[PDB]
Amino acid sequence: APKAPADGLKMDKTKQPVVHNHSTHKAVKCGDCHHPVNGKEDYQKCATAGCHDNMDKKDKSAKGYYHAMHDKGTKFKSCVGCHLETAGADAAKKKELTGCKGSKCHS
Ligand code: HEM
Ligand code: HEM
Ligand code: HEM
Ligand code: HEM
């Protein structure tokens, strides 16, 4: 089985880079994020060519990188989508986990 990498991983395809820690996500199954493609969980970098390689932040296709990290209603929960559910009605956790600035994702 593939192993989780070290914490402190920077996602840096954009000018708004974000650090991802596997240890804080250890209760989420690996394949919720490294989701099936052609029937197999895919552990390539999310923006690999042919994957979420469209860097237009307005794109909502299966290639849109921004969309895959921020939007609701997606086949797999996105970073923000899952965090909204986690925060619930708690506005402090909404700021921390889903705020566009001043949050745990973006300063
Ligand atoms: C579950 C224990 C689990 C495994 C296994 C796993 C593996 C993994 C690898 C091998 C990488 C590095 C990919 C590379 O070649 O650089 C990696 C990276 C990311 N992961 Fe992961 N991962 C596991 C679990 C989870 C969970 C539960 C999430 C989602 C909450 C998740 C997400 C990510 C992200 C994002 C990356 C960075 C990929 C990128 O920037 O393209 N992982 N993981
Ligand atoms: C990297 C860890 C990674 C993330 C994050 C990610 C997210 C993601 C979401 C949120 C969706 C749903 C979008 C929607 O509008 O429903 C989604 C869908 C697909 N992805 Fe993805 N994805 C990550 C990694 C990868 C990799 C490495 C590839 C390419 C091999 C890839 C591809 C796709 C495709 C295709 C879809 C659509 C799948 C289908 O409808 O069953 N993703 N991804
Ligand atoms: C998507 C790639 C993604 C990112 C980025 C991300 C970030 C993140 C941060 C920065 C935290 C705070 C802790 C830390 O610094 O590591 C955090 C915390 C939680 N997350 Fe997350 N997260 C991403 C994805 C997802 C997804 C897809 C889920 C659920 C399916 C999820 C869940 C959680 C949970 C739960 C936490 C803990 C919340 C807290 O209050 O302590 N994340 N994430
Ligand atoms: C709040 C809804 C919110 C906004 C708005 C937002 C914006 C934003 C921008 C403009 C980028 C860069 C896009 C580009 O291509 O130029 C970006 C990138 C990432 N974000 Fe974000 N973001 C908002 C909220 C959050 C939160 C709360 C998280 C984490 C749960 C998060 C995550 C990400 C990730 C991952 C990226 C990509 C980082 C990279 O590869 O450089 N965003 N966001």
Curated annotation (Swiss-Prot):
For heme c 3, which residues are the binding ones?
H25, C79, C82, H83
* Post-translational modification comment from the UniProt entry: Binds 4 heme c groups per subunit.
What are the subcellular locations of this protein?
A: Periplasm
Residues binding heme c 4, per UniProt:
H70, C100, C105, H106
Lineage, top-rank taxon, reads Bacteria
Does the keyword Electron transport belong to this entry?
Answer: yes
**Other comment:** The second and fourth heme binding sites have unusual CXXXXCH motifs.
Function as written in the Swiss-Prot or TrEMBL entry: Participates in sulfate respiration coupled with phosphorylation by transferring electrons from the enzyme dehydrogenase to ferredoxin.
Q: What is this protein called?
A: Cytochrome c3
